[PDB]
Design a protein around this ligand. Structure first.
Ligand SMILES: [Zn+2]
Ligand SMILES: [Zn+2]
Lengths: 62, 105, 239, 193, 237, 842
């Protein structure tokens, strides 16, 4: 069993949480979960989980 | 098959023109004739039965793993007989250690 | 009709070739020995004791090389491009002479192959001795032909050069003499027992049938294209 | 055994398109099918008003009729890719326990005993071959379905219903109407005309 | 009709064939294979019986001899003349000779097909192109629609409208189901309805019929692959 | 040694519960673990010394000098030959500062500190150095290295090199170990690792497979052959005989000295002599006077094969001079030759190339038939036989080899895998540093300056400043990562440990067929035990309950015995023509075709009887007689999977005599021929008294194999056996002349240890048995009895365990883990739906 809060170790490269419970942060919404959420037309849970609870950043384009 | 009488090497056919003459790398020729006229052959349902399984059929009476039937052997009057099923045709051949063959091999 | 070994023909052949008879009698038997050892005749392996002796095969190969070269010489007219030796030997002859060569030069192959096989299956040592005797007989009976003169010169040159190259090859198969190993262009030279530079990739024995063959398609048993995490693969259990 | 006897006299003539071996295999597969009569002894020894296993099977709660027949009456014929056990052990031997060119039905996967009666050693081996084939297929399922599903998903993912209820890729049409009726798949009822 | 539509290739009508380096321009002596020298008794009987097909002078020196198995010859019931006409029509580079369909049940029907000089028109060895010729002859279609490996009669379950307007469902309808798709040959044949040809292959439907028929065929194939508890029809659409 | 008449045996009271006694006897004899321990012991006793001494002989010449001294100006080449002949492994020792006190390292101490249970290897070498000057000058320098040790090889737990070898259970408890565990694992960096059994194709066997995968479509049927010159530690060489779509039969030899170069078969044949194509064709097809259809087909195929061209070997295709072909191979396959035109003028260079080429070809081309030039013709005969077999398969006379069959498979564990890893690692991590150090001191120190003492520290110091592998980090990395099957020792319970020690791994339609239950598994591989999830299914096999793994037998003793038999005509006496004319049957020992017997069945029967006696032929030898090809194969190599099978004897001789007497009475016309016919009787000589003795301990499997009651049957020989699956079936066919069995099985012998834990398993669906074997290895319980001393990770110890109320034979050897819970099969509120359980809180 595992449960993680909104803070924890984040990957140095991608900014994403680490892998699994052993690294004290993670659990994954892989390709299939994104397909399912899109099929439901979520796009606000996808925003939340993939950006706010993951490597969220604000790019700037000229 | 044709082997050079000099250096014992394979001889190419080289059909020229109405007659076949064999050429070696050393140059000797042998004048193939009559029989050598055949080039290639293919006969369907051939290469099995009495040539493919001759060893196996010969050894079958002495193989303990072969199924045996309750049929009298005409040659030696042994009560039991060795039974074989061969090929896609499921040809049943009955053998014996005496030498009986059921005339199926 | 019987046969027996005649050492006199071997001695005559060695004299004509100005080398010791120990070299002629040791054809196919100088492996692992130096030529200086061959000339003295010492260390000669005993007569072959079984049909499996590679010496019989070696001497038969020598006789076969001789007969093959002689057959190229006999039928030069039938070659679009004859090999180097015959072309060097026959370049001065006429086209009519080249065609007549098929008629003039004797058929020296005789019944060699069949009776050699019979001897080898029946007696190996006599088979080796007969192979050497037949090689000597063929070489001299081609040498000691007398008529006509032009074929005499051609056949004498042929026999000398081809027996010389046979003996030279047999000496090449023998143990090398002392020499510098610099010829081969590398900073080092291996050996026949080089456990130092040995492909360790083969030390790990190929204990599988189809190793060289390469499969590139996706393995139909992997999770490479499926997306599940560990301890969540338990959901893929039976039922 | 009658089919085998006809084979002993060479009385089996295959139809055109099938060899004697394949026709013999088909004939034996047909001859060893379990008749529907097999339910009679099972149902005679079952009290349907109180038998828990039968009430589970009959009401559709769990299990099927073949499970009940296997448990109580007999397994019958084992099939691996709609054919009996091929003699893989040796030339003409299905198992070490059976003679070469064996003609009895038991040698090729016929299980006379039921699960409750207990399976013998070769019957258990044949059942294990069948079960392992099932496990292999189940394990193949995840991988093959994942490959095909990902390919299909990336083929179709761009198809989005637009404001005209057409299915369109970017702006290029894929469909004039979604199901050709424009209806969600969750809002359909089957009614007779 | 199923038997008629099935493809019957020449290789299936032969028990053995021999490629020989001999010719039969007649006039000259012979030069014959030893075991085949007995053929002369009918080689000349063919010239007597068929005086309109004398051996051409441009015959090559490459003959292939065929023996026809009468059991499968009468099983599928092909006349020898039909075989000979199919071989002759499909090949003008060979001069066909054959025995007589005597129905003797003891002597086999022999066809000797002699290569012509025009056949050796190819950059390749004469023997090798002759060996290509025999293989092509063994592949030549004799009867049936090409690519139709099999054909089996299956009763179908179909709906029809009666004179009273009732939609009756007929089970007596019979039609054949083949292996291998060649829609074009099926349309050509007259015993088969051309407008009700159904093929399991999407490619042949695309080529023959068009893209709408190909789309419907895709739906049908995906549906029959789906099984019983398949998805909705709009997903297949 | 005649036996008592089978008609007088009484077995009617022999029940299945008595056959369980025979199963127990077999398990006790094999020990259920001892194969790996004894394999490792044999490794460190016989293999590693032979691997270092015989196989590792160095001979390399360097070419670089310093242009200062006139001796250094007249010198170009220096040749060094050093070979170790002294080696031993002593038990692990702990020394803190690596020397001094030299106390014995204990396994618990190694585990606690993260140490390694490794022992030092003391080596001594004879080093011979020569420098080859110009103008034929040569001097020799000889050095004798004192016995020294720079290595530590990991030592398994339980071998005689382990300190717990013959320790008593009380003394094991004192040393802090587990009294009941058998060992079998290596203690590396504080962790226990088990080298699993790796299944490998059988060596010295022609594996023929069609390439029907249909990729690289140019290729056709390929018949490969891995040739091992002797024991399992030897350097094996592989030859691959490929039939191609172009008609070419090309032989590719892959070995350490030389690999990956496709060569036409006639070339390989004629560089050994016999350059006449007639002789080569005769060797392949064994006879030319017979026409046949088999001979005609092979003859035409070989004619096409020789006639067709080859791209790479173009110059020598028609070269009838074997010397030119040898030189071509030497310059194409030998390294260090970058100038083809350089050697074209030196005679000595060509002589050396030819000598080295003949040496490598002798050692590389079918080494198992010999490694001296006197056996080249028999090597050619065997190569012709292999080509004949492949082409015979091509004619559809025979089917391709069965990849999944266990007739041609061997389980190599611990000894063999570590032997090969050791040879590769030792080669690199010893030769490369030593050779580079010798080259460096050569570059610096004057050669004639080196004294006997100087070379000694030259050799010792070069293998002292080494940290690349040290052999220890490398051996540990091989053991951890893993052709050395490995698995972290998962201490879930005792059954998990044992099953890990009994796991057979592959390390290789191929995905499907290689996971099915093959028909050769029964008796040797647990038909039930396998994985359940993902690709692991069918990947880890398990040994059956009675199956063990044989060790290398007396190959030479049996070979000499066969060669002394009057009825075996050696290869020298019989030629291929004599083989076909008389229909002689080939005799093989370990794949080495020696001799030809007149009657294969008679020879096999006689030697099987002799093995049954046990004094003259070891019981573990495999005597497989192929009735299809009329061959007798004797096998004594390691990795064979024997199991003990009770022997069924009958009175077929007396039955035949009575039948013939009845026939003569019928011929004489007497109607009383019935009284002259006797009933056929077949039985096993196993009596209930032997079962009771087996349980009583007065009789073991050794006494059974000695008496001839039972015998060990390998899969190869199992194909020659007709086994009754139970004593019940033998009793049923006790008077049936149509079911003359050769052995009687015990049905519990077909299941593994984990599968036998399931009670009434045959009443269950077999797939459920498989998931039980999966789950029987995961249950918590008394995994180890020394748990307080160990520092374990993710290990669960269950206080209470109970013997099952319905126990099985698998609990006679493992400790039950679980309780006899009273379970009500009922619906209680729907909280146990879909594989849930309602547990009593109390
Ligand atoms: Zn020639
Ligand atoms: Zn008889």
């Amino acid at each position: 069993r595992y449960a993680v809060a909104s803070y924890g170790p984040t990957d140095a490269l991608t900014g994403q949480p680490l892998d699994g419970k052993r690294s004290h942060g993670g659990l994954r919404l892989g390709e299939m979960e994104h397909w399912v959420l899109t099929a439901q037309g979520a796009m606000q849970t996808i925003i939340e989980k993939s950006h706010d609870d993951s490597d969220g950043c604000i790019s700037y384009i000229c | 098959m044709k082997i050079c009488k000099a250096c014992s090497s394979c001889m190419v056919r080289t059909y020229v023109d109405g007659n076949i003459i064999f050429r070696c790398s050393c140059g000797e020729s042998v004048q193939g004739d009559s029989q050598n006229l055949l080039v290639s052959s293919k006969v369907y349902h051939t290469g099995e039965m009495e040539d493919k399984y001759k060893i196996f059929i010969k050894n079958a009476p002495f193989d303990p793993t072969n199924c045996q039937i309750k049929k009298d052997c005409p040659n030696c009057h042994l009560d039991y007989l060795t039974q074989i099923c061969i090929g896609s045709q499921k040809i049943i051949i009955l053998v014996c250690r005496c030498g009986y063959m059921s005339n199926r091999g | 009709e019987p046969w027996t070994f005649d050492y006199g023909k071997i001695i005559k052949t060695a004299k004509i070739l100005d080398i010791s008879p120990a070299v002629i009698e040791a054809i196919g038997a100088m492996e692992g020995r130096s030529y200086a050892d061959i000339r003295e005749g010492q260390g000669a392996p005993p007569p072959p004791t079984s049909m499996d002796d590679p010496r019989l095969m070696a001497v038969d190969s020598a006789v076969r090389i001789f007969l093959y070269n002689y057959n190229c010489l006999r039928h030069v007219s039938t070659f679009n491009k004859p090999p180097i030796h015959v072309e060097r030997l026959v370049k001065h002859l006429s086209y009519e002479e080249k065609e007549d060569l098929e008629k003039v030069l004797p058929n020296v192959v005789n019944e060699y192959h069949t009776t050699f096989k019979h001897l080898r299956v029946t007696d190996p040592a006599s088979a080796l001795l007969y192979s050497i005797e037949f090689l000597c007989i063929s070489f001299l009976t081609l040498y000691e032909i007398k008529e006509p003169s032009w074929v005499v010169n051609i056949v004498r040159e042929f026999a000398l050069t081809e027996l010389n190259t046979i003996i030279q090859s047999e000496k090449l198969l023998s143990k090398p003499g002392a020499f510098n190993f610099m010829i081969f262009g590398e900073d080092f030279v291996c050996s026949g027992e080089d456990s130092s530079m040995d492909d360790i990739s083969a030390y790990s024995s190929p204990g599988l049938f189809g190793e060289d063959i390469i499969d590139r398609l996706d393995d139909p048993f992997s999770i490479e294209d499926v997306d599940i995490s560990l301890d969540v693969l338990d959901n893929l259990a039976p039922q | 055994e009658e089919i085998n006897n006809r084979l002993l006299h060479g009385d089996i003539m295959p139809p055109i398109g099938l060899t004697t071996h394949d026709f013999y295999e088909k004939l034996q597969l047909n001859a060893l099918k379990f008749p529907d009569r097999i339910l009679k002894p099972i149902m005679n020894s079952i009290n349907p008003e109180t038998n828990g296993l039968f009430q589970m099977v009959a009401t559709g709660a769990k299990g099927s009729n073949p499970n009940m027949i296997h448990i109580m009456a007999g397994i019958g014929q084992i099939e691996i890719n709609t054919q009996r056990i091929q003699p893989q052990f040796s030339f003409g031997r299905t198992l070490v326990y059976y003679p070469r060119f064996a003609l009895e039905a038991q040698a090729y996967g016929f299980i006379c005993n039921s699960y409750i009666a207990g399976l013998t050693s070769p019957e258990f081996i044949f059942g294990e071959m069948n079960g392992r084939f099932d496990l292999i297929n189940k394990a193949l399922s995840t991988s093959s379905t994942g490959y095909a599903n990902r390919k299909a998903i990336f083929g179709l993912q761009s198809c989005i219903v637009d404001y005209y209820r057409r299915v369109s890729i970017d702006t290029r049409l894929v469909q004039q109407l979604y199901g050709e009726d424009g209806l969600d798949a969750r809002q359909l009822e089957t009614v007779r005309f | 009709i199923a038997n008629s539509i099935e493809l019957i290739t020449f290789e299936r009508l032969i028990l053995q064939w021999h490629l020989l380096y001999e010719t039969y321009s007649s006039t000259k002596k012979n030069v014959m294979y030893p075991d085949f020298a007995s053929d002369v008794e009918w080689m000349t009987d063919f010239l007597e019986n068929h005086p309109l097909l004398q051996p051409p002078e441009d015959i090559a020196n490459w003959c292939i001899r065929l023996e026809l198995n009468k059991t499968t010859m009468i099983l599928k019931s092909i006349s020898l003349e039909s075989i000979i006409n199919s071989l002759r029509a499909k090949h003008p580079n060979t001069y066909i000779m054959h025995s007589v369909e005597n129905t003797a049940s003891g002597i086999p029907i022999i066809i000797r097909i002699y290569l012509r000089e025009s056949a050796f028109r190819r950059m390749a060895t004469d023997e090798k192109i002759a060996v290509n010729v025999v293989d092509k002859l063994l592949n030549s279609t004799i009867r049936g629609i090409p690519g139709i490996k099999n054909a089996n009669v299956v009763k179908l379950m179909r709906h029809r409208v009666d004179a009273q307007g009732k939609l009756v469902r007929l089970d007596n309808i019979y039609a054949i189901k083949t292996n291998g798709t060649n829609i074009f040959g099926a349309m050509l044949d007259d015993n088969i309805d051309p407008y009700t040809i159904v093929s399991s292959s999407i490619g042949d439907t695309m080529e023959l019929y068009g893209i709408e028929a190909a789309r419907q065929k895709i739906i049908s194939e995906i549906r029959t692959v789906m099984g019983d508890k398949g998805p909705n029809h709009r997903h297949l659409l | 040694i005649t036996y008592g008449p089978i008609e007088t045996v009484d077995n009617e009271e022999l029940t299945e519960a008595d056959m369980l006694s025979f199963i127990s006897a077999a398990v006790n004899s094999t020990g259920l673990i001892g194969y790996n321990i004894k394999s490792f012991d044999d490794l460190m006793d016989n293999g590693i010394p032979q691997i270092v001494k015989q196989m590792f002989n160095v001979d390399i010449t360097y070419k670089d000098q310093r242009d200062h001294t006139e001796i250094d100006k007249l010198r170009e080449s220096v040749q060094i030959q050093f070979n170790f002949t002294d080696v031993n492994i002593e038990r692990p020792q702990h020394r803190n500062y690596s020397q001094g006190n030299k106390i014995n390292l204990l396994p618990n101490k190694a585990r606690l500190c993260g140490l390694s249970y490794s022992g030092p290897v003391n080596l001594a070498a004879e080093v011979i150095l020569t420098a080859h000057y110009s103008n034929g000058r040569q001097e020799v320098k000889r050095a004798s290295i004192p016995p020294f040790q720079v290595s530590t090889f990991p030592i398994m737990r339980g071998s005689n090199r382990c300190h717990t070898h013959h320790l008593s259970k009380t003394a094991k408890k004192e040393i802090g170990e587990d009294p009941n565990e058998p060992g079998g694992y290596f203690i590396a960096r504080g962790g226990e690792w088990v080298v699993d059994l790796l299944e490998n194709i059988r060596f010295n066997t022609l594996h023929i497979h069609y390439h029907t995968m249909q990729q690289g479509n140019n290729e056709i049927i390929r018949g490969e052959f891995i040739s091992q010159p002797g024991g399992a530690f030897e350097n094996s060489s592989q030859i691959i005989i490929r039939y191609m779509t172009t008609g070419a039969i090309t032989i590719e030899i892959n070995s350490t000295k030389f690999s990956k170069l496709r060569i036409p078969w006639y070339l390989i044949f004629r560089m050994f002599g016999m350059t006449g194509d007639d002789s080569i064709i005769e060797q392949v097809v064994f006879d030319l006077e017979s026409n046949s259809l088999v001979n005609t087909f092979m003859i035409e195929i070989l004619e096409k094969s020789i006639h067709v061209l080859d791209p790479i070997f173009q110059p020598v295709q028609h070269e009838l001079n074997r010397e030119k072909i040898i030189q071509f191979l030497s310059e194409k396959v030998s390294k260090f030759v970058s100038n083809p035109s350089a050697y074209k003028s030196d005679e000595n260079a060509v002589q050396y190339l030819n000598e080295r080429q003949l040496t490598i070809l002798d050692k590389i081309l079918l080494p198992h038939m010999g490694q001296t030039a006197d056996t080249r013709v028999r090597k050619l005969r065997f190569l012709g036989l292999l080509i004949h077999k492949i082409l015979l398969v091509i004619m559809n006379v025979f089917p391709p080899t069965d990849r999944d069959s266990y007739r041609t498979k061997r389980v190599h564990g611990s000894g063999v895998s570590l032997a090969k890893a050791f040879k590769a690692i030792f080669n690199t991590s010893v030769i490369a540093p030593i050779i580079n150090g010798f080259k460096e001191l050569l570059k610096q120190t004057a050669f004639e300056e080196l004294t006997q003492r100087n070379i000694i520290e030259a050799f010792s110091a070069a293998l002292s400043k080494n940290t690349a592998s040290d052999l220890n980090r490398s051996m540990e990395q091989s053991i951890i990562s893993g052709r050395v099957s490995t698995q972290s020792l998962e201490r879930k319970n005792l059954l998990n440990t044992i099953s890990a020690l009994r796991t057979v791994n592959t390390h290789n339609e191929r995905a499907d067929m290689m996971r099915r239950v093959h028909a050769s598994y029964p008796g040797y591989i647990c038909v039930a035990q396998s994985a359940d999830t993902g690709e692991k299914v069918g990947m880890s096999k398990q040994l059956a309950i009675t199956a063990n793994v044989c060790t290398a037998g007396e190959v030479l003793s049996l070979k000499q015995r066969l060669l002394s038999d009057p009825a075996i005509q050696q290869l020298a006496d019989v030629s291929n023509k004599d083989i076909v004319r008389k229909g002689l049957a080939r005799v093989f020992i370990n794949g080495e075709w020696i001799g030809c017997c007149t009657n294969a069945f008679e020879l096999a029967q006689r030697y099987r009887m002799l093995r049954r006696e046990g004094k003259v032929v070891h019981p573990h030898t495999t005597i497989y007689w192929d009735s299809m090809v009329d061959e007798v194969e004797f096998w004594l190599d390691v990795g064979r999977l024997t199991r003990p099978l009770l022997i069924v004897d009958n009175n077929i001789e007396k039955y035949n005599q009575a039948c013939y007497k009845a026939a003569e009475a019928r011929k004489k016309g007497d109607k009383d021929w019935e009284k002259h016919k006797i009933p056929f009787i077949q039985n096993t000589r196993f009596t209930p008294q032997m079962a009771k003795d087996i349980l009583a301990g007065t009789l073991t499997l050794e006494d059974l194999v000695a008496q001839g009651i039972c015998e060990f049957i390998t899969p190869e020989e199992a194909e020659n056996c007709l086994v009754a699956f139970s004593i019940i079936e033998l009793r049923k066919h006790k008077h049936d002349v149509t079911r003359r069995f050769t052995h009687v099985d015990v049905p519990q012998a077909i299941l593994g240890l984990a599968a036998l834990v399931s009670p009434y398993a045959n009443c269950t669906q077999p797939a459920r048995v498989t998931y039980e074997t999966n789950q029987g290895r995961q249950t918590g319980g008394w995994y180890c009895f020394s748990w307080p001393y160990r520092v374990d990770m993710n290990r669960f110890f269950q206080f209470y365990n109970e013997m099952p109320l319905v126990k099985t034979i698998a609990h006679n050897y493992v400790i039950p883990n679980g309780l006899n819970t009273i379970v009500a099969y009922m619906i209680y509120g729907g909280y146990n739906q879909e594989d849930s359980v309602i547990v009593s809180q109390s």
